[PDB]
Amino acid sequence: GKLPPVYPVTVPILGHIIQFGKSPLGFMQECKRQLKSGIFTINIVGKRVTIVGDPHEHSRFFLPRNEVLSPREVYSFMVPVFGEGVAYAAPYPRMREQLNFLAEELTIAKFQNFVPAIQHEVRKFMAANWDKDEGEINLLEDCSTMIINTACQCLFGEDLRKRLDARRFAQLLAKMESSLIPAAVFLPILLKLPLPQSARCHEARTELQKILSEIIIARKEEEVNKDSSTSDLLSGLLSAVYRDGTPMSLHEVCGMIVAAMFAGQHTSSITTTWSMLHLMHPANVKHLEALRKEIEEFPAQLNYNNVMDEMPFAERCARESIRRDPPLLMLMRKVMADVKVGSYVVPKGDIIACSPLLSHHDEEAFPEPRRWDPERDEKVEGAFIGFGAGVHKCIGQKFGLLQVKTILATAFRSYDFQLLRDEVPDPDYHTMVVGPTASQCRVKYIRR
Ligand code: HEM
Ligand SMILES: O=C(N[C@@H](Cn1cncn1)c1ccc(Cl)cc1Cl)c1ccc(-c2nnc(-c3ccccc3)o2)cc1
């Protein structure tokens, strides 16, 4: 009656999923062009997915309440990692309380200490691995390693870090990441079947929870004497009290730690990696010299004020990396009730989606979208959705960018880099969180 245009189904069981796999951006643009409409419906394994692909209409996706546009069903596949009743799996008011508590642990007030702590970890890394006059590295692997160290330095007590060090924490997160199946969104039977991948999620989460409980017990054994107990993400969340007067359970605390550490790890690593890749490319020398000018007068020891107040260009670099190659390609909700978007009604039962990948390549909002240009601004309000928006906007943005900017400032003060390829790497769309193709990320570092 008032449905968006349906892109024709020509291969029935998997309507558009194979073409989407082959070229996510190419596919979606072709739907947009052929149907002459930013708002269109594709068919994924038999499920209607209505894409809100017109930037002018972003608010119709991001602003409706959970009860109308629901995130629970689309995050169901992450329950084995977050836990039953945690985050999106909890009743919505309780979901928001949990997410709010997490947000409060990532506030700007803590950054006074985070900045030197982060730089210290970075400098430790570089000293140990970038210690030659010049050397070849995988930049993606190395940025990932730095982000695990910097994040854990900020958010984990030293006792926790001893128990769960960078190597072990990486392995744990990797076991989780490699064992999740986003396809379960469209093949919900997967969540009910015996799968090795589900078992592995349970093992990893159980290992983490065991470690947390041992740390909690040890702190309680030792605290009365200390006069100075450990303050970290774990202790913060443990002291949270819900509006009904009850504390978070360890189960919930573990899940929220999984959520934070998982969320921050890949996105922040990938963002740092893309930024450095672009900045070291010849097409972008004007931009590199803009970064080197920004940071030229900084102390050897970055402080809060340097990073928070005096790095607007470095931040523009991070943001435009996410603009061009957003780590999260597709944001989704389940439609619980009919919703107006543009000239259309999206029916109850649809999955509705808003794709940072598609929207970031709308040529009205972002002319020449495959050009990386940190000096661009959007020409359509709210077109940039790299960190989402509205009800579920990213709560980790500032902390993520804090780490990115600190690495950029620290790396480029002491090194140049040469990309060992003519072009900036292709994005690799095969993974949950999309980064540059790992095998294309070998670079030469050169000490200054
Ligand atoms: C570093 C680059 C980052 C990018 C590009 C990014 C991107 C996003 C996006 C697109 C969303 C929206 C999800 C949706 O609409 O369904 C989101 C939400 C979220 N992000 Fe991030 N994020 C980043 C860093 C972080 C970090 C460092 C953390 C935690 C330390 C974090 C934690 C979260 C959480 C908890 C949510 C859910 C918010 C809610 O549901 O209300 N993110 N992020
Ligand atoms: O990593 C995921 N979610 C993360 C996103 N994140 C927020 N900041 C940093 N990352 C996440 C979100 C909320 C919370 Cl609290 C914890 C996490 Cl850790 C995630 C990745 C991919 C998908 C996904 N599901 N379906 C797709 C998809 C569907 C069609 C085409 C392409 C992708 O992608 C879902 C979740």
Short mmCIF file of all heavy atoms in Angstrom, two decimals, residues 8 20 42 56 84 117 127 158 175 183 209 231 244 261 263 283 358 368 383 403 409-410 424:
data_model
loop_
_atom_site.label_atom_id
_atom_site.label_comp_id
_atom_site.label_asym_id
_atom_site.label_seq_id
_atom_site.Cartn_x
_atom_site.Cartn_y
_atom_site.Cartn_z
N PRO A 8 13.95 -6.56 -6.70
CA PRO A 8 13.40 -7.85 -7.13
C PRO A 8 14.23 -9.04 -6.64
O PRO A 8 15.46 -9.01 -6.70
CB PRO A 8 13.44 -7.76 -8.67
CG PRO A 8 13.49 -6.30 -8.97
CD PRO A 8 14.29 -5.70 -7.85
N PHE A 20 25.24 -9.01 -1.93
CA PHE A 20 25.73 -8.13 -0.87
C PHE A 20 27.12 -8.56 -0.41
O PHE A 20 28.00 -7.73 -0.20
CB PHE A 20 24.74 -8.10 0.30
CG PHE A 20 25.08 -7.09 1.36
CD1 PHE A 20 24.27 -5.98 1.57
CD2 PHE A 20 26.21 -7.25 2.16
CE1 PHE A 20 24.58 -5.05 2.55
CE2 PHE A 20 26.52 -6.33 3.14
CZ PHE A 20 25.71 -5.23 3.33
N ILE A 42 15.32 -4.86 0.78
CA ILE A 42 15.94 -6.06 0.23
C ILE A 42 15.46 -7.30 0.98
O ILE A 42 14.77 -7.20 1.99
CB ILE A 42 17.49 -5.96 0.23
CG1 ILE A 42 18.04 -5.71 1.64
CG2 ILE A 42 17.95 -4.86 -0.71
CD1 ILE A 42 19.56 -5.71 1.69
N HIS A 56 18.82 12.25 4.66
CA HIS A 56 17.84 13.22 5.16
C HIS A 56 16.88 12.55 6.11
O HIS A 56 16.23 13.22 6.92
CB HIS A 56 17.09 13.86 3.99
CG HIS A 56 17.98 14.68 3.10
ND1 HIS A 56 18.38 15.95 3.43
CD2 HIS A 56 18.57 14.40 1.90
CE1 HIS A 56 19.17 16.43 2.47
NE2 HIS A 56 19.29 15.50 1.54
N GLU A 84 22.90 -13.78 29.10
CA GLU A 84 21.45 -13.61 29.26
C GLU A 84 21.13 -12.43 30.17
O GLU A 84 21.77 -12.25 31.21
CB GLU A 84 20.83 -14.89 29.83
CG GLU A 84 21.17 -16.15 29.03
CD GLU A 84 20.16 -16.47 27.94
OE1 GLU A 84 19.28 -15.62 27.66
OE2 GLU A 84 20.24 -17.58 27.37
N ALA A 117 48.89 7.71 30.92
CA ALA A 117 48.88 6.24 31.00
C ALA A 117 48.90 5.59 29.61
O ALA A 117 49.66 4.65 29.34
CB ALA A 117 47.69 5.76 31.82
N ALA A 127 59.16 1.37 21.83
CA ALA A 127 60.52 1.09 22.27
C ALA A 127 60.87 -0.36 22.00
O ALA A 127 61.97 -0.66 21.53
CB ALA A 127 60.68 1.43 23.74
N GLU A 158 45.77 -3.15 38.19
CA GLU A 158 47.01 -3.87 37.97
C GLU A 158 46.88 -5.35 38.36
O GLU A 158 47.46 -6.22 37.71
CB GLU A 158 48.17 -3.22 38.73
CG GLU A 158 49.43 -4.07 38.76
CD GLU A 158 50.68 -3.27 39.06
OE1 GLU A 158 50.81 -2.76 40.20
OE2 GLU A 158 51.54 -3.16 38.16
N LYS A 175 38.81 -15.45 20.70
CA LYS A 175 37.98 -16.65 20.78
C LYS A 175 36.50 -16.28 20.67
O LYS A 175 35.75 -16.92 19.96
CB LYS A 175 38.26 -17.41 22.09
CG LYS A 175 37.49 -18.72 22.23
CD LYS A 175 38.00 -19.52 23.42
CE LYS A 175 37.25 -20.83 23.62
NZ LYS A 175 37.87 -21.68 24.69
N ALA A 183 25.12 -13.83 10.89
CA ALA A 183 24.07 -14.43 10.06
C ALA A 183 22.89 -14.95 10.89
O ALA A 183 21.78 -15.13 10.36
CB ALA A 183 24.65 -15.54 9.20
N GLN A 209 34.78 -14.54 33.51
CA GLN A 209 34.04 -14.37 34.76
C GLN A 209 34.78 -15.00 35.96
O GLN A 209 34.75 -14.46 37.06
CB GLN A 209 32.61 -14.90 34.68
CG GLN A 209 31.84 -14.59 35.95
CD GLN A 209 30.42 -15.11 35.94
OE1 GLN A 209 29.75 -15.11 34.92
NE2 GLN A 209 29.95 -15.55 37.10
N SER A 231 40.84 0.91 42.13
CA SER A 231 39.73 1.58 41.45
C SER A 231 39.84 1.41 39.95
O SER A 231 40.78 1.91 39.33
CB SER A 231 39.72 3.07 41.80
OG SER A 231 38.50 3.67 41.42
N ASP A 244 15.99 0.45 41.44
CA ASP A 244 15.19 -0.35 42.37
C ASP A 244 15.97 -0.72 43.63
O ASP A 244 15.47 -1.45 44.49
CB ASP A 244 14.66 -1.61 41.69
CG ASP A 244 15.76 -2.62 41.38
OD1 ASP A 244 16.93 -2.37 41.74
OD2 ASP A 244 15.43 -3.67 40.79
N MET A 261 35.02 -3.95 26.27
CA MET A 261 36.34 -4.31 25.78
C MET A 261 36.28 -4.82 24.35
O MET A 261 37.15 -4.53 23.56
CB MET A 261 37.00 -5.33 26.71
CG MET A 261 37.07 -4.90 28.16
SD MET A 261 37.77 -3.25 28.40
CE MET A 261 39.42 -3.52 27.78
N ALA A 263 33.79 -3.93 22.20
CA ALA A 263 33.40 -2.76 21.42
C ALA A 263 34.60 -1.88 21.10
O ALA A 263 34.76 -1.41 19.98
CB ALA A 263 32.33 -1.95 22.14
N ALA A 283 49.10 10.90 -1.64
CA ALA A 283 48.00 11.81 -1.96
C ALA A 283 47.70 12.77 -0.80
O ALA A 283 47.04 13.79 -0.99
CB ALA A 283 46.75 11.04 -2.37
N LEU A 358 26.60 2.73 3.25
CA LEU A 358 25.81 3.35 2.18
C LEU A 358 25.70 4.87 2.35
O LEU A 358 25.93 5.64 1.40
CB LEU A 358 24.41 2.74 2.10
CG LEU A 358 23.55 3.32 0.97
CD1 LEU A 358 24.23 3.13 -0.38
CD2 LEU A 358 22.17 2.68 1.00
N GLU A 368 32.36 12.75 -3.92
CA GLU A 368 33.62 12.03 -4.16
C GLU A 368 34.02 11.15 -2.97
O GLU A 368 35.14 11.25 -2.45
CB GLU A 368 34.74 13.03 -4.49
CG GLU A 368 36.01 12.37 -5.02
CD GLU A 368 36.95 13.36 -5.68
OE1 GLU A 368 36.50 14.47 -6.04
OE2 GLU A 368 38.14 13.03 -5.85
N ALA A 383 24.40 13.23 8.43
CA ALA A 383 24.78 12.23 7.42
C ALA A 383 25.84 11.27 7.94
O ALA A 383 25.82 10.08 7.61
CB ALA A 383 25.26 12.91 6.15
N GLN A 403 42.33 7.34 22.56
CA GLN A 403 43.42 6.41 22.29
C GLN A 403 43.99 6.62 20.88
O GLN A 403 45.21 6.65 20.70
CB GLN A 403 42.95 4.97 22.47
CG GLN A 403 42.61 4.61 23.90
CD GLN A 403 41.95 3.25 23.99
OE1 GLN A 403 42.60 2.25 24.30
NE2 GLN A 403 40.66 3.20 23.70
N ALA A 409 49.54 11.15 17.61
CA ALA A 409 50.48 12.16 18.08
C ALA A 409 51.81 11.53 18.48
O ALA A 409 52.87 12.12 18.26
CB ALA A 409 49.88 12.96 19.23
N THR A 410 51.77 10.35 19.08
CA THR A 410 52.98 9.71 19.58
C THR A 410 53.78 9.06 18.44
O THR A 410 55.01 9.17 18.40
CB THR A 410 52.66 8.67 20.66
OG1 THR A 410 51.92 9.30 21.72
CG2 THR A 410 53.94 8.07 21.23
N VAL A 424 46.20 2.78 -0.73
CA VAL A 424 45.70 2.48 0.58
C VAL A 424 44.95 1.15 0.54
O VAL A 424 44.21 0.89 -0.42
CB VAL A 424 44.80 3.65 1.02
CG1 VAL A 424 43.39 3.16 1.33
CG2 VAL A 424 45.43 4.38 2.21
#
